[PDB]
Amino acid sequence: MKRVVITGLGIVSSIGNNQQEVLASLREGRSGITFSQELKDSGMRSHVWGNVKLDTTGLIDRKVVRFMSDASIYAFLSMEQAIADAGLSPEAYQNNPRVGLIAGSGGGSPRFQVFGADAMRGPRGLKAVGPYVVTKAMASGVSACLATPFKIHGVNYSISSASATSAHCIGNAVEQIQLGKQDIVFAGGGEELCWEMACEFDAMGALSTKYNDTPEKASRTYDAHRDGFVIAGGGGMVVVEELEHALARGAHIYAEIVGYGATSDGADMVAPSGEGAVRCMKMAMHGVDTPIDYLNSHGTSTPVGDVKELAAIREVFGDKSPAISATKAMTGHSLGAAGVQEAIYSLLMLEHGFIAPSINIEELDEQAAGLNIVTETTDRELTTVMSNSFGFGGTNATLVMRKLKD
């Protein structure tokens, strides 16, 4: 019965290191994909990625960063921005039982898990591994590494669900508030970018391989010649807060979360069934009386994936389908961080009245025919937006956000 809003955001992504940079990129349809020497040298076929253009060296206190992996670093920087953007002072959120944190990653830290085994197998054994690998490699690193330094006393854990990870963290945060257990929950996620993890996707043929020479055109959701997704990394964090608590401190409210769906396909391990997506979106729209103005699709730019979701979208909206665009064409697929980052791109579109373009569509796929997929930045007043996140294991998450009435 309690209402939930988002009052702060922070983000470190392939298209910007803060909301101002991300905003500019979204408006210009600027690609964040670059050529990766690291990937080429690893022997992978996919040589493109959506990397965070930022040197994180010295940006975090040494006694804190020694426990963190990149996913944690990205999520940490995103949280610092979110706190600042939310206008929360230490005495408000620190050592407060009503303030928690729910953030996770898709793979934890393959890089440090491998570093650990490599070091152990060297002549120095244990001495070479060091005492900080566990907090870097454990799956809950993103939450453990942020909750501790920020003095969080409320809920503290990570939710992981492949590409839906950070979307579920936000949804669960919403539930914590609706249950009256928390007033504020920092929700988000992070994902490192490395060949140790990337090669695994390359091995199953999930990554784009035909456009290494033109990195900016590799990610091309809904294009007839898409050939897999482009791996990316980074972090994002949003401040999920109970409505009255937010109004009481005169917070800036981006939007209210009015719908959250989380379903399971129970079918295929790697491909969506579409059936689960239909249920997920319908569940998220239950109770939402206003139409969806814009839908930030999951669209990873994969042959099967993009169309399964388009079919699900046709079945749910029929002849009233919303404007659609896949930001992954610009950013790439950040996996664990995708959910929160795309929620942020959607909040920015809602806050600034515009629809980011779905770029790189030279030839539209037959199955996308008739849908209103925006291909050029369009100014427009949005009121209700939806964002999809579907991960391996048939896990689905959908978030619906709406502007707060005047």
Ligand X SMILES: *C(=O)CCCCCCCCC
Q: Which residues bind ligand OH (CB under 6 A)?
A: 163, 167, 298, 338-339, 342, 389
**At CA 30, angle to CA 203 and CA 70, rounded to 5?**
50
Question: Least Å distance between CB 45 and its own copies?
Answer: 7
CB of 340 to ligand X, least distance (A): 14
Contact residues for 184 (Cβ-Cβ < 8 A; gap 6+) = 88, 93, 96, 98, 99, 100, 154, 239, 240, 241, 242, 245
Q: Contacting its own copies (CB under 8 A), which of 14, 19, 78, 160? A: 160
In three-state secondary structure terms, 109 is coil
Task: Reduce the DSSP state of residue 213 to 3 states and report it.
Answer: coil
**Residue 172 touches which of ligand X, ligand OH, its own copies, none (CB < 5 to 8 A by kind)?**
its own copies
Binding mask 162-181 for ligand X (x = CB under 6 A): xx------------------
Q: Are 11 and 32 in contact (CB under 8 A)?
A: no
CA dihedral 116, 118, 122, 124 (to 10 degrees): -20
78 binds its own copies (CB under 8 A): no
Q: How far is the CB of 294 from ligand OH (least distance, A)?
A: 15
Site size toward ligand X (CB under 6 A) is 13
Q: Which is nearer to ligand X, 88 or 399 (CB)?
A: 399
- Determine the residue type at 139: A
Using the minimum distance from each CB to ligand OH, give the nearer residue, 140 or 389: 389
Structure-block tokens of residue 86: 């939310």
Contacts with its own copies in 54-73 (CB under 8 A)? Answer: 67
The binder of ligand X chosen from 44, 137, 185, 239 (CB under 6 A): 137
Cross-strand pairs, 324: 295, 373
Choose the contact partner of 46 out of ligand X, ligand OH, its own copies, none; CB within 5 to 8 A by kind. Answer: none
| DSSP code at position 66 | T
Dihedral, CA of residue 66, residue 17, residue 245 and residue 161, to nearest 10: -70
Q: Contacts with ligand X in 83-112 (CB under 6 A)?
A: 106-107, 110
Residue among 197 and 400 whose Cβ is closer to ligand X: 197
Q: How many CB atoms sit inside 10 A of residue 231's CB?
A: 31
